[PDB]
């Protein structure tokens, strides 16, 4: 089970009945002559006959490639029909923003930079989601415009691939450390950490070759609300983003450990990324207010 | 001649950063042998993929056209090991944990807290998942993982029965209740409403009730996380229905009350349940399940 | 070109739709548990909303799962249709069989084929196809009978029926006059994957084993090429075969036919009979 | 640990093979390495592909799963390479020509002594006229050689295509072997022809002439391909006195004005 048609054989077959030459159709392909020279021979192997005659000048169509023009087109409408029909279903209003972002952002920063600008943003209704399909995935949802803004860390692992750069428009939020933190009570030691999967825990595992101590894992996860929570319980040391243990540290139930000697930390940016081609209105004005 | 795997990243990382010492770093080689990698896939692919006379290093229009190849071989090689890959244990003092985003937040740790000593010994590996609930159900057969929490599940249609395969226990019975900022109570017309994402477990048992009910909820924001429900009804953007197990502490505090005291039927019942595999006997699982009950 | 639909998430959609259980749809889609899973994420991503409610077991249809089904219906219904509406547009008669072979097979073989049974096949028309598609290609076009038989070289098939025609050698040939500049064949052809690994000057290199004949007989070094191919000029001492006494250099090879066991057209069948021997 | 590409080839061998010994050989690798290889593979891949308990060696069902993977995996790097690959100029002296079986051999020969120091790759070719013009002056080629704007041009010579039967035959409709209806032959022939019975058909002159030498009946094929077969009585031109049903054609050589190799040069003069 593994001669599927590829949709995009379609479209190469329109742009090369339509320009009627190998190297503009590649062209506008965007692809080399040579991919786009096997792709249309791979359309006629699954066809079954050749669609072009390339004894011609310039290339034109047989008498199949006659005949098959209209299933071409069909099924590239079908797609698109597709795609369209369900590109509102995201949509419950066109006031609606819909958003993802780290766990650890849904919960501590958007609901804070909301009610900061809740005037200017009541006529809007944010939907929140944290990130959850991995970030080549979040990141073509983007693209595709069925999510608004996607909020990240400015890590290696949540870049954008780099075909995709190009697509999108990043402002910063604010700048922030991964910090250690221990309930007051502190000395081996019970280490509270991140899944080796996940995007924290490569910023954080190299780091910690450089400590001394040697550690006692005892917990893992993969949200860092999940080893606030533990910390705070008095379960060991966690490394996690200030800006979600604010009062935390004020009201002493937490505490950095080695707390001056800063490069046990990690300096990391929140990001926000947006797609360029995405000018709903309502995402315009909540852009216009963070940025 | 072979194609070599890690010539892609090399690529890819060389095309971000501008400059071979930052690419070598990223890829944890010397700055020497990042050359000799680039200068390798150069040669095998038999074009120049980057313009290095140019400050920062850009790609030549071949190079333009490799970003799809070795983006889509880099993709293919991971999916290869990914649909692959086993069932792992680290130690056979771990236990497995999985669950829904928001449990993991305010049920497990406290617990797991509540418990201290006597799971202290033990090793808690805790990964969110929104897979289905029939992915986890799986998992536990597959003894991919040991243990699942979750909210009680209404079958949408009849089912195959379970317990020759899993065992059920029931964690926690609360009510999922109204709660407003103290400053919005005496407002309580047409209110604002924080409300679940239709496709969680809490839409379809709030909603339900939310119907039956001479309120005009105007729908302000959505989400899949009951703490982030929490933090918006803190600062006074409208009512929102949650779990009571959330909000232990912002009652406490008085930073949140419930709304409309007087009408309990408002208030919907919700049981928080613990599922394990028949056939898994780890003594790990074991202490933590007699812990739990 | 970033995201495209593919058409296998249909069947597994309609797989998943139907059976209410990941790895049950996964075992009906014969791939493993976790690719089904990662491919039924791929459709959702690319829609852009959820088509399976995940909190329900068995696993049940989204509002937007149960809206999506005739677009995937008709979908797959029109990729059948584009298929069926082109099946066999090669054949022009019913007495044709489609040949497709390797461009040596098809001066040096074919023909002789033809001939040596020339009554047994009179009544059939024969249209022969070199070609330099993958032989995966050529199999799959067996499969979908769009053509009928395949002749090439060797040292899915359970739809493909095969037979051996001849068994042979590779072998260095020379001019007499010499006792090394070499003529070769270019690094994409079949004979290219089969000499060059068994093994000299670059003077000469093509597709075409018969281009390499003439260079050979031309005194202009050595070539390798099939035994089949070079019988007459054998004969009349215009090549000998070079280092004869070390069958170290040479390279048996076989000569097969496939067909696909699900053709049963009589011109076909016919001609196979003819050849099996 | 990474991938290692060769071990899908090795992989692929063995299933085909089922034997270890047999697939070494056909990977050319000691069978001890060969074994090395598949295990490294499946330590990566983290299940037992193969099943080991008879012989032949079978594919476990996580093995049979893997096929798939495999074959996507190698038909990507085949691509990856096959979708740049350009100008194989293996010496300063490599003539790089695009085209005609008969033609490229007889010309070299005809001055080996002046083209000793070269070496010609040639390659027959089907895409575009537009796109082996556009590939001369991008200097991925050398030369063009075909059948009749800053492109210098060439006769090889003016000669004809001719109708050819074997002796054998003194005939009315006749067997008729015909080129295939999408390759230039075919538009030069079916025009000036327009009774002949279909009986075979294909793309290669040399592929008509053999089964014209058989007598199976008449074809049309350009001189130069039988200038031999005429001079051995092995096949006659029909209808001699109709000397109107001879389609005259051209052979020409293109090259790019642009190209300075000299190697390049040293061919042309040989040519012209
Ligand atoms: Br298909
Ligand atoms: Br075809
Ligand atoms: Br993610
Ligand atoms: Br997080
Ligand atoms: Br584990
Ligand atoms: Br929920
Ligand atoms: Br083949
Ligand atoms: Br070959
Ligand atoms: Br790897």
Redesign the interface.
């Known amino acids: 089970?593994?001669?599927?048609?590829?949709?995009?054989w379609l479209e190469d077959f329109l742009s090369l009945m339509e320009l009627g030459?190998?190297?503009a159709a590649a062209k506008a392909?965007?692809?080399?002559?040579?991919?786009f020279?096997?792709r249309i021979?791979?359309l006629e192997?699954?066809?079954?006959?050749?669609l072009f005659?390339?004894?011609?000048?310039?290339?034109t169509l047989?008498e199949?490639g006659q005949?098959?023009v209209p299933?071409a087109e069909?099924?590239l409408n079908?797609?698109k029909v597709?795609?369209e029909?369900?590109?509102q279903?995201?949509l419950?209003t066109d006031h609606?923003v819909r958003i993802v972002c780290l766990?650890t952002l849904?919960?501590?920063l958007?609901?804070?930079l909301?009610?900061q600008s809740?005037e200017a943003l009541s006529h809007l209704?944010?939907?929140?989601?944290?990130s959850?399909?991995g970030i080549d995935?979040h990141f073509?949802?983007l693209?595709?415009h069925?999510t608004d803004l996607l909020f990240t860390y400015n890590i290696?692992a949540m870049?954008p691939?780099?075909?995709?750069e190009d697509k999108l428009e990043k402002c910063v939020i604010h700048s922030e450390k991964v910090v250690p933190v221990v309930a007051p009570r502190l000395l081996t030691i019970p280490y509270l950490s991140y899944?080796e999967h996940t995007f924290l825990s490569k910023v954080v595992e190299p780091v910690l070759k450089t400590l001394p101590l040697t550690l006692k894992?005892?917990?893992?996860?993969?949200?860092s609300?999940?080893l606030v929570?533990?910390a705070i319980?008095?379960?060991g040391v966690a490394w996690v983003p200030m800006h979600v243990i604010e009062e935390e540290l004020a009201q002493h139930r937490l505490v950095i450990a080695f707390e001056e000697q800063k490069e046990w930390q990690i300096p990391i940016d929140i990001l926000c990324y947006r797609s360029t081609t995405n000018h709903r209105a309502a995402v315009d004005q909540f852009w216009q207010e963070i940025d």
């Not at 392909?29 to 991919?35: E, G, L």
């Not at 005659?53 to 290339?59: A, C, L, V, W």
């Not at 894992?217 to 949200?223: A, H, I, S, Y």
Request: aromatic share 10%.
């Open positions: 089970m593994n001669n599927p048609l590829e949709f995009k030459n190998f190297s392909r965007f692809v080399t002559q040579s991919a020279s096997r021979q791979a192997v699954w066809i079954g006959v050749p005659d390339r004894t011609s000048y310039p290339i047989t199949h005949k098959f299933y069909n099924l079908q797609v597709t795609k029909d369900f590109a279903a995201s419950k609606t766990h849904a919960v501590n958007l609901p804070k909301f009610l809740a209704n944010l939907s929140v989601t944290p959850v399909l995935a073509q949802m693209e595709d069925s290696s870049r691939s780099l075909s995709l899944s894992p005892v917990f893992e996860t993969t949200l609300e999940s929570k533990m319980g008095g379960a």
